[PDB]
Design a protein around this ligand. Structure first.
Ligand code: Z3D
Ligand code: Z3D
Ligand code: CL
Ligand code: CL
Lengths: 649, 649
């Protein structure tokens, strides 16, 4: 038995960990399956992709083509359907009809071996007819056979009879494939559309209170949901909603001593009042949480809860399960760290004394919130807990509940970041906030939209409570507008943390990425109604971008993305396509100066020939332009951060 | 079960076809095994390579190191011993001693938790000592334990006792490894040294005749073997030695009709006199061939026979096994082609009517020559026969006779070139003859000495009967000298085709790579005595290069190779190392003009600091130089093609 088959089919992609983990897609998402295919000699090969659903049923006939001359690399686009575990193979074969037609078109006009070449075609078409089940289809091919053999007909007419549309139609439904050779199946995990596509909004329920009761409840925070839904978001991500420890509770601005009424960090989970399966008493009860989830769902909002596998020194686990922590020789537990940052208010979990008990308890907690309608979890710093722990936990949960989505907040080195995605995390936080120049954005999105897309789905949060980038600090509102346009149009999943739309951008100090007076350590009442009346919010732009995404399928996918050259380093241009929908975006990355540039479009990447016009509508303004292969743009910060255009068909 | 283990070990290399085929090595060859290794959290990891012989016996402790900062890619060099099928794994582990030392070096001077830090250190070193055999080593560690616990000494003194060179020494030999996690084994096929290392000489026995009998016999051709052994060659490659067909025999200069005296192409195998298992009657008998083999072996020469799976129209196969050929409807068999080459004198083989019969006959023919002492086969155009056919044939032969070496003469597209090596060909011809500029040579050898070396062993023939490159045509003798130095020092296997040493460089016509009056179609007597006496041969340079290779282990391997920058595009520089042996080569690629340049050596790549001097001997002349990080060279074509230096002491 040989490893290589009769017609070699080699190195099928996408592949993840040599086939030990599945490649990823979502329902309705297209992607390319590729392979190295060739044969000995110079006759033509053909190849096709066989995509099989969870019941083993094959998809449509999906022929591949050589992707670049002389490379022997072949590809075809497939489209994922219903959720579940699929598989794909590549089949390769000798293509005798293509081979013969190429020879006949050369030899017959020159009168070379005319009778022999035509007879080769005749018995070939007889061979193709042998497998054709329909009487009328066979009669079609046999008619071409008889014409090819008709020596009382001019040679050019004998040949032409083999090349009619009616003949092609029979062979398109019953191609003659010789020496068919197949790869061994590769796995594909197809998940729900929200795993790839959605707009996220993060806020702290406790900040949405009243003057008499400053600490918000789930009942008072629910009245923020209409604004979030009106802004076009799909997912509401809440920081931890559990009781918060008192021992070593942090004060305002990340100080080490809480005083008086200080509320502490929600990530310092646990007290005698309860742990990860309980509600902070100041937020209300489990019934109040159910009300919040119900009202969110009525507005089309899904809840994502924070899952932080750690605890305050007051969490019941500390004395119930000491073996879930690392102890020093005096029995004390060192506080958690993530250098240069220190988390003096929490203990990290240790995994090597009782990994089974920890897995059991983790999936118990997840299933509790899942029973209360939470089908999405934002997992904190997963890279400080074992990779195989997450692989086990995610397999357990998705085994019974495949719709649950896990988002990995792993800002770390690339190997870890990729591996967490590959072992099951549906979504990943990314380096987006630290990619701000044209070359940074072009290189990083080229990576994310390329091979990484077979295992990672990016969530572009333009800010988080822990990341206020210097680009926003120094650029002000025009910079918030730019980063919103970029996040919303470069990834099918993007997000903001509350206050982004108010352009809050005061750092803790120069050179920090923390917010001054951070909401992680204090209630932050915001007068949303006043900000809207004073026009100091970019909620309208955010709303518009989410509507554009909902109206243009090209923005609801990741992999089809092309950057078009401009002649100014501050002006970036790119297009995305899905079916007949094309979106073309031009962004001025300079938040301080107007920028003029010529955008030179790669017309064929738009499906257009070089002389065609490009009728576009700028969805930010409603204006129409008659663009072509080279277009002058002028973008003024504070007025026109970008053009977000749909190509008119 | 999870795919990822406790400590992630991912993407172990070398790997061939995802582990379905073995990686390659030869006895005594060192190569790098690498992996992606990291863990959760901030603590240190270590890793090591476990190489196991065919009996499962493990090699020595082989610790790995991170290859570049922040990449999580680790590697170590291993060395293959005896031939057979080996395996290797990577083990990764938590490194608690490195972790503790890092924290102690910070916290002790800071005065943070110093009692706890020192006691954790004492318990850790006690754990490390538990596994140390040898009273001396275990006692050394336990003495550090007791010093760490000695509260009558200052904290800094207690720590310092854990960090002494004598303590490091024990830990380097008995490292304390936690959470040890293994990759799954990967296969390694270790073959005899000649598969990687050897000098090859090709000649036509029939050209080595006498004044009275111009068609050489095996007995007259045996008289050429002493001169071949004297230039330091190890392998003699003969074109086909079988009867030659008469139907469509080619005449001189690749003309289509032979006259009565014309000898034809040796590749047009077969006649009523016999096929692939017979001797051309003008060469003599099988007993004469045995004499030739015996004489070669006495001179230290191995024979490689040409194996051409094809035949003339007169071969016995044509009537005995018609199903081994594709017949057109009129019964004709189209002559072979390798476009744009046409081979009107031969039929190609067809593989799908009787694959078992062809495989049986192929291995029968090989075993016949194998029984007569031929253990190396040069396989013509293997890419025009099925890849899986060669996989089957090579596995059959090497299953009973693992010493047999197959060389693939596949000048074709890269995918096929790579796949043939991967399915078992011990050696491959390469693009060497079409890589002549500095950029071409540097890029191509970086490829061959990199990942490709896990599955392909290059044989650098500087010419063949089918390839007289324009570089040699235009450059004359100084170009022959340059290509000899390059071939002999950049690959552990190189070769020339007879007449190269005479600088034969007249092409068939401008733009051709054929020789005028090619030896493929006519006897080519050469006056070896005259050329030697008149000094118009570069045989002494060839001899010196083979002696240098025999004296310098760095030149008997492939993968250790580094290119050093020069300031002249015509001057290339590179070094190779094997243990303490370092060879440094500087070549002037210009065959017409003297070139002077500064070679700026990457000193750490030579194991030297930037300021040191390196004493070198130019092995081509015996002159000694004192070189450093920057060295002036002046190379005069005709006088000096190159410096081929060894580093002294
Ligand atoms: N990256 C994740 C996990 C981090 C650890 O919880 C969390 O850090 C917050 O919570 C800590 C514990 O309460 C505080 O010590 C800390 O100062 C504060 O910033 C991040 O906000 C969150 O995004
Ligand atoms: N590449 C391999 C195989 C080739 C095909 O056999 C062989 O071609 C030679 O032999 C043919 C058959 O006799 C001739 O028609 C041809 O003109 C001549 O060049 C090559 O020399 C050899 O290196
Ligand atoms: Cl953080
Ligand atoms: Cl050839």
């Amino acid at each position: 038995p040989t490893v290589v088959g009769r017609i070699p089919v080699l190195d099928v992609r996408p592949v993840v960990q040599r086939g030990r983990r599945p490649a990823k897609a979502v329902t309705g998402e297209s992607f390319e399956v590729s392979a190295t295919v060739f044969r000995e000699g110079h006759d033509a090969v053909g190849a096709n992709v066989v995509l099989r659903d969870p019941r083993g049923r094959p998809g449509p006939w999906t022929p591949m083509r050589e992707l670049a001359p002389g490379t022997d690399r072949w590809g075809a686009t497939v489209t994922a359907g219903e959720t579940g575990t699929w598989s794909y193979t590549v089949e390769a074969w000798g293509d005798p009809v293509t081979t013969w037609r190429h020879h006949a078109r050369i030899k017959i006009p020159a009168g070379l071996d005319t009778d022999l070449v035509l007879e080769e075609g005749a018995r070939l078409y007889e061979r193709a007819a042998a497998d054709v089940p329909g009487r009328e289809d066979r009669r079609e091919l046999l008619a071409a056979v008889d014409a090819l053999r008709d020596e009382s007909r001019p040679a050019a007419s004998r040949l032409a009879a083999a090349l009619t549309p009616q003949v092609d139609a029979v062979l398109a439904r019953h191609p003659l494939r010789d020496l068919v050779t197949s790869s061994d199946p590769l796995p594909l995990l197809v998940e729900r559309e929200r795993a790839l596509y959605g707009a996220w909004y993060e806020f702290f329920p406790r900040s949405e209170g009243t003057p008499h009761t400053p600490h918000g409840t789930f009942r008072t925070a629910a009245r923020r949901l209409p604004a979030i839904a009106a802004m076009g978001f799909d997912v509401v991500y809440l920081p931890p909603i559990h009781p918060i420890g008192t021992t070593h509770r942090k004060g305002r601005n990340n100080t080490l001593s809480a005083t008086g009424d200080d509320v502490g960090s929600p990530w310092a989970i646990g007290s005698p009042e309860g742990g990860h399966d309980s509600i902070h008493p100041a937020l209300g009860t489990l019934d109040d949480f159910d009300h919040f989830v119900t009202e969110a769902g009525k507005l089309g909002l899904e809840i994502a809860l924070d899952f932080a596998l750690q605890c305050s020194p007051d969490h019941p686990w500390v004395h119930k399960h000491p073996e879930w922590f690392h102890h020093r020789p005096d029995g004390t537990i060192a506080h958690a760290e993530n250098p240069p940052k220190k988390y003096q208010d929490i203990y990290p979990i240790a995994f090597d004394a009782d990994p089974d008990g920890l897995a059991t308890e983790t999936v118990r907690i997840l299933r509790h919130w899942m029973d209360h309608g939470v089908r999405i979890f934002r997992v904190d710093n997963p890279h400080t807990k074992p990779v195989a722990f997450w692989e086990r936990v995610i397999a357990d949960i998705n085994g019974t509940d495949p719709d649950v989505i896990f988002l990995a907040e792993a800002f770390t080195r690339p190997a870890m970041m990729a591996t967490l995605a590959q072992i099951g995390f549906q979504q990943s936080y990314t380096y987006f906030t630290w990619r701000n120049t044209k070359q940074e954005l072009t290189e990083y999105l080229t990576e994310l939209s390329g091979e990484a897309a077979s295992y990672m789905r990016p969530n572009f949060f333009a800010n988080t409570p822990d990341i206020l980038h210097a680009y926003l600090q120094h650029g002000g509102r025009p910079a918030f507008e730019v980063r919103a346009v970029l996040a919303a149009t470069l990834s099918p999943t993007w997000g903001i943390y509350s206050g982004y739309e108010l352009c809050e951008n005061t750092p803790l100090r120069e050179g920090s990425e923390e917010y001054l007076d951070s909401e992680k350590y204090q209630l932050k009442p915001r007068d949303w109604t006043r900000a809207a009346r004073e026009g100091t919010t970019i909620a309208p732009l955010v709303t518009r971008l989410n509507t554009i995404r909902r109206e243009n399928p090209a923005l609801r996918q990741l992999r089809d993305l092309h950057f078009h050259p401009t002649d100014k380093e501050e002006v970036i241009a790119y297009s995305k396509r899905q079916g007949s929908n094309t979106v073309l975006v031009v962004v001025n990355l300079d938040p301080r100066h107007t920028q003029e540039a010529t955008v030179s479009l790669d017309m064929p990447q738009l499906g257009l020939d070089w002389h065609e016009s490009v009728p576009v509508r700028d969805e930010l303004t409603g204006e129409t332009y008659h663009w072509g292969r080279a277009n002058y743009v002028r973008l003024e910060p504070g007025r026109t951060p970008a053009h977000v255009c749909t190509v008119l068909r």
